[PDB]
Amino acid sequence: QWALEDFEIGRPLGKGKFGNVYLAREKQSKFILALKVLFKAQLEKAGVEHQLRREVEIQSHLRHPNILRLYGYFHDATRVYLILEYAPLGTVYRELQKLSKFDEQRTATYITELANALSYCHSKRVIHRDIKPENLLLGSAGELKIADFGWSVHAPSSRRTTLAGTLDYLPPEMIEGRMHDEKVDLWSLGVLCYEFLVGKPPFEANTYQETYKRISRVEFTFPDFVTEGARDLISRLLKHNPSQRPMLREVLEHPWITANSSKPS
């Protein structure tokens, strides 16, 4: 159906490991969108064709206000192209570098919108496994949207692919290569909640080796300015034992979330 000829390409929106994302307009409808470009050579060398398929299948079938739409794809002997919903206000990562820290109102609203999208996901036994600020995008009303479904699977699951970049958002069971389920996303939620309020992830370190050590041991501490309610929610999510982590309903009706969030469940 679609081909490159159907689009005018615009400015770079961002770079990923494989993805190079560009602003683009469809010639006949003037529809504005984002075009994620992958290089087949890079994809074959790394052996991650299966991740691209999963991204296309899981993300085109899902429909939720807090999850980024994927519309289609095509490909041309050198490259693969995913056709995405464009997110006008950028990434949560950028917003965090801009402000350094989010206040309690901003943090709880984001956490609510995440828990809504995740709950809709888990209801089809879909788990993301790669929740981090670089993959959280912002709509035209500032609403949070989950993107980058490349690492997502159906539960339960083991890991078959090499962990490439940062260990910072991954739970113990997953870095130790053990078996994992829905509860991995709840751990990611707790890492993110801490990073929003503090300005850096709770297990951050100088080397891979040491980061690995702080995560499996669950060594983190709070700065003085983090209130009692935030500490309670974050301590509940960052439990070594998956089964001791809360359900998403518990997060969404936790007293500190309801007191500060400006969006409902």
Ligand X SMILES: Nc1ncnc2c1ncn2[C@@H]1O[C@H](COP(=O)(O)OP(=O)(O)O)[C@@H](O)[C@H]1O
Ligand Y SMILES: OCc1ccc(Oc2ccccc2)nc1
- Could you list the active site residues? 130
Closest to ligand X by CB, 13 vs 248, is: 13
Decide the pairing of beta strands 70-75 and 79-84. Answer: antiparallel
- Does 183 belong to an annotated binding site? no
13 contributes a contact to ligand X by CB under 6 A: yes
197 contributes a contact to ligand X by CB under 6 A: no
Q: Which structure tokens are listed for 128?
A: 């993301």
| Per-residue interface string for the shown chain with ligand X, residues 20-49, x marking contact by CB under 6 A | -x------------x-x-------------
- With CB under 5 to 8 Å by kind, the binding choice for 56 among ligand X, ligand Y, Mg ion, none is ligand Y
| Per-residue interface string for the shown chain with Mg ion, residues 99-138, x marking contact by CB under 5 A | ------------------------------------x---
Is 85 in a helix, a strand, or coil?
A: coil
- Does 85 belong to an annotated binding site? yes
Q: Which structure tokens are listed for 71?
A: 């519309």
For Cα atoms 47, 50, 53, give the angle at the middle one, nearest 5 degrees.
135
Sequence-ordered list of residues with C-beta below 8 angstroms from that of 25, at least 6 positions apart, any chain = 7, 8, 10, 31, 32, 33
Instruction: Compute the distance between CA of residue 136 and CA of residue 113 in angstroms, rounded to an integer.
Output: 11
Of 114, 121, 137, 191, which lies in the binding site for ligand X, with binding defined by CB under 6 A? 137
- Does 148 belong to an annotated binding site? yes
19 contributes a contact to ligand X by CB under 6 A: yes
- With CB under 5 to 8 Å by kind, the binding choice for 52 among ligand Y, Mg ion, ligand X, none is ligand Y
| DSSP assignment letter at 180 | B
- Count of chain residues binding Mg ion (CB under 5 A): 4
Burial 35-53 (b: 16+ CB within 10 A, else e): bbbbeeeebeeeebeebbe
91 contributes a contact to ligand X by CB under 6 A: yes
- With CB under 5 to 8 Å by kind, the binding choice for 13 among ligand X, ligand Y, Mg ion, none is ligand X
Of 14, 139, 199, 246, which lies in the binding site for ligand X, with binding defined by CB under 6 A? 14
Q: Radius of gyration (Cα) for the chain, nearest Å?
A: 19
Q: Which residue has the tokens 């309690």?
A: 104
Of 2, 8, 10, 17, which lies in the binding site for ligand X, with binding defined by CB under 6 A? 17
Interface contacts to ligand Y, rule CB under 6 A: 49, 52-53, 56-57, 73, 75, 80
195 contributes a contact to ligand X by CB under 6 A: no
148 contributes a contact to Mg ion by CB under 5 A: yes
Alpha helices by DSSP H, listed for the chain, are: 40-46, 49-61, 92-99, 104-122, 172-175, 183-198, 208-217, 228-237, 248-252, 255-260
131 contributes a contact to ligand X by CB under 6 A: no
- With CB under 5 to 8 Å by kind, the binding choice for 84 among Mg ion, ligand X, ligand Y, none is ligand X
